[PDB]
Amino acid sequence: MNLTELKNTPVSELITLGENMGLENLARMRKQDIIFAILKQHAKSGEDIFGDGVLEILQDGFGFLRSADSSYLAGPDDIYVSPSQIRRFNLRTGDTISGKIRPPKEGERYFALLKVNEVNFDKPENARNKILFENLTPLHANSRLRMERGNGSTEDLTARVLDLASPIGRGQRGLIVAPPKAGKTMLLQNIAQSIAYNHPDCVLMVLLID
Amino acid sequence: GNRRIRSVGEMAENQFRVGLVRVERAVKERLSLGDLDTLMPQDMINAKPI
Ligand SMILES: Nc1ncnc2c1ncn2[C@@H]1O[C@H](COP(=O)(O)OP(=O)(O)O)[C@@H](O)[C@H]1O
Ligand code: BEF
Ligand SMILES: [Mg+2]
């Protein structure tokens, strides 16, 4: 069973599913161990598990595949991947993996990986011989990112002024220097909205720290 | 003619064979669940029993 359907679903449907499976009182614990027990039960009565996430390699040698909604945090929902995959497919930290996984026996508690299917939205054959990040040659931005939507709403004028003051392109570094109380949150929200509406092909990521 | 002498050689050989059959049973019980292209013949056998 796929993982994302149970990850991004509301916890109420998970409670209903766990109560229908005839299990222990499920709603009394975290969402993490709830979905862990749900996956364990569905694997005990069902087929292989299908998981996905982002890979982190520790100083120990193995790897942990963590989901996006938990901000990639430790818990029962992580996926253990042996160093054998890191030696065969030559994995790296931050690799977006998605593939088949199995339940754990004694001595283990995390779902072990069985066979990778998609590595960073690409075939393992194409990803084997590739180019490193730091080995690339940086350059200046050439394709400008159009931030104007064209509707001219009450607040999109902000983005318009942005296009008037800071033409953003693919590969530019933007530093928003603003004291508190200044209204940058909705500014970044509108920027993200416009850049996803005008350029839906490029991936968009936001990070809220502290 | 009916009494045979044994030395360190075959004695150590028999001890190594005992260790080998122990670790062979271990790796066979472990291998009953293993699959293809998911391991190397290094961690399958444990050096501690030998
Ligand atoms: N384009 C805008 N139109 C109307 N009000 C705005 C606009 N930008 C900011 N504000 C006001 O400024 C305030 C900024 O709040 P907040 O997001 O906490 O500040 P900051 O983004 O600097 O942390 C909001 O309460 C909002 O009402
Ligand atoms: F500028 Be506020 F503190 F987000
Ligand atoms: Mg703010």
Swiss-Prot record, chain B:
Organism domain of life: Bacteria
Disulfide bond positions: none
Function per UniProt: DNA-dependent RNA polymerase catalyzes the transcription of DNA into RNA using the four ribonucleoside triphosphates as substrates.
Quaternary context: The RNAP catalytic core consists of 2 alpha, 1 beta, 1 beta' and 1 omega subunit. When a sigma factor is associated with the core the holoenzyme is formed, which can initiate transcription.
Family to which the UniProt record says this protein belongs: Belongs to the RNA polymerase beta chain family.
Record-given protein name: DNA-directed RNA polymerase subunit beta
Lineage: Bacteria, Pseudomonadati, Pseudomonadota, Gammaproteobacteria, Enterobacterales
Gene (UniProt): rpoB
